Amino acid sequence: VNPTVFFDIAVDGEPLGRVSFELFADKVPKTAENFRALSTGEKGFGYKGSSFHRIIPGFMCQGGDFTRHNGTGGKSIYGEKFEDENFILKHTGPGILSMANAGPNTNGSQFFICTAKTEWLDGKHVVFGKVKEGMNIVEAMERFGSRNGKTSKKITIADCGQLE
Amino acid sequence: SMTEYKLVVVGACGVGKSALTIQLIQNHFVDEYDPTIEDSYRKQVVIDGETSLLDILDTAGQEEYSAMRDQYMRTGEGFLLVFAINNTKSFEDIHHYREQIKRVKDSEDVPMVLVGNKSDLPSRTVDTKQAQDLARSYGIPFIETSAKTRQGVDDAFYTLVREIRKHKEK
Numbered sequence: 001v002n003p004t005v006f007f008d009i010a011v012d013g014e015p016l017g018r019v020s021f022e023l024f025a026d027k028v029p030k031t032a033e034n035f036r037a038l039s040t041g042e043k044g045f046g047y048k049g050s051s052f053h054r055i056i057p058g059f060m061c062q063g064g065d066f067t068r069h070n071g072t073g074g075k076s077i078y079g080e081k082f083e084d085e086n087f088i089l090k091h092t093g094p095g096i097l098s099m100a101n102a103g104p105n106t107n108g109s110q111f112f113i114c115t116a117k118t119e120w121l122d123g124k125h126v127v128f129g130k131v132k133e134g135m136n137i138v139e140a141m142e143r144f145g146s147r148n149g150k151t152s153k154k155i156t157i158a159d160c161g162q163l164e
Numbered sequence: 165s166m167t168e169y170k171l172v173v174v175g176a177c178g179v180g181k182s183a184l185t186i187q188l189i190q191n192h193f194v195d196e197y198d199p200t201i202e203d204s205y206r207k208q209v210v211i212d213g214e215t216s217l218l219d220i221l222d223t224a225g226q227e228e229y230s231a232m233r234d235q236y237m238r239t240g241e242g243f244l245l246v247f248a249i250n251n252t253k254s255f256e257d258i259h260h261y262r263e264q265i266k267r268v269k270d271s272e273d274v275p276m277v278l279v280g281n282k283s284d285l286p287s288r289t290v291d292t293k294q295a296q297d298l299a300r301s302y303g304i305p306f307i308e309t310s311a312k313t314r315q316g317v318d319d320a321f322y323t324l325v326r327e328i329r330k331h332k333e334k
């Protein structure tokens with residue numbers, strides 16, 4: 001009964017492929033619901049159109065700033081920030097979906113997909129989902145990154161929503 | 165002949181490390197905040213009649229990655245300790261940076277300059293006497309800068325080079 005959402009990824013507007021996620025509403029309900037609703041756009045704002053602005057090979061693909069469009073913004077469905085729900089789930093390997101933040105209790109909309117185990121983030125970033133299908137698309141995205149996260153072409157969420 | 169120096173810019177997130185570097189390298193300033201992971205720059209300058217290549221390492225203001233931090237401090241020959249005159253915590257952070265640099269380098273005497281940035285802003289929370297007194301207690305220079313007006317920018321980097329040169333005489 002955990003929800004599934006899809007991203008259709010684009011490179012300078014051209015379709016790259018689809019990534020789907022299982023959202024762990026069974027263990028992290030409020031954080032999963034934020035990401036779900038941002039993916040559907042049902043609140044009148046969300047991820048559709050926004051970019052993966054920071055992609056560091058061997059670590060993660062980070063996106064979700066639909067308010068400032070530069071890596072510094074984002075907002076949740078509960079307000080600008082919300083607290084860290086729990087740390088039950090850990091950064092166990094590639095495909096983990098976790099919240100970005102600027103310190104404790106600053107979750108908004110930005111998120112990252114791990115491309116490796118990132119265990120030093122355990123207890124500091126809330127894990128709330130995992131890649132279901134399309135890890136090969138995530139690996140393609142990772143190739144557009146660089147040492148300092150700058151991407152060689154514009155990587156966007158051209159479409160997104162809830163699967164079912 | 166010429167010389168070459170590895171300068172490292174450290175300090176809390178948001179204080180203006182990148183803006184200061186981009187003014188020195190590219191002679192412009194933008195309001196938009198682009199948070200740093202890590203960036204490097206080379207620039208040839210003439211300081212006190214001596215031509216030098218500055219290898220500038222612009223670090224992120226972060227406190228989670230100590231092994232990368234330590235290597236930055238091992239390789240750097242001089243360090244800009246940047247705080248913002250409207251960020252009291254960034255000034256309270258400064259002593260931590262000097263402590264870590266001295267530890268990694270295993271030395272009491274490491275080329276450093278204290279940089280009080282955003283001096284253009286009307287929202288000061290750190291008075292300059294505080295910063296002057298701290299730099300004096302360290303025996304290092306204190307330079308007031310604004311990346312936005314370019315005030316003090318060349319001064320900060322050139323002074324750091326002079327401190328490196330003074331250290332090499334010992």
Ligand SMILES: *CCC(=O)N1CC[C@H](C(=O)N(C)[C@H](C(=O)N[C@H]2Cc3cc(O)cc(c3)-c3ccc4c(c3)c(c(-c3ccccc3CCOC)n4CC)CC(C)(C)COC(=O)[C@@H]3CCCN(N3)C2=O)C(C)C)C1
Nearest residue numbers: 056059071072100101102110112147177199201224229232
């Ligand atoms: C004082 C900090 C602060 O308040 N702010 C506010 C504005 C910034 C901010 O937090 N956001 C924009 C925030 C966000 O994106 N959060 C990130 C965490 C983060 C932010 C920033 O600005 C920089 C860094 C992390 C960072 C800096 C330097 C790093 C770094 C991360 C990593 C490494 C590294 C370690 C070991 C080997 C290699 C490297 C990198 C170079 O070689 C490839 N360095 C260099 C010392 C760590 C990796 C994993 C490589 C990158 O991690 C990230 O980017 C993390 C991953 C988890 C998710 N997040 N980014 C965040 O949540 C917005 C508002 C969400 C600063």
Ligand SMILES: Nc1nc2c(ncn2[C@@H]2O[C@H](COP(=O)(O)OP(=O)(O)NP(=O)(O)O)[C@@H](O)[C@H]2O)c(=O)[nH]1
Nearest residue numbers: 177178179180181182183195200225282310311312
């Ligand atoms: N008014 C004013 N704003 C400044 C000055 N220096 C930097 N800023 C502004 O402060 C913000 C952060 O600057 P930035 O140089 O990116 O800071 P940083 O220390 O490199 N941050 P990080 O540690 O994340 O890399 C930007 O919006 C920038 O325009 C200054 O001298 N005056």
Ligand SMILES: [Mg+2]
Nearest residue numbers: 181182199200
């Ligand atoms: Mg910077």
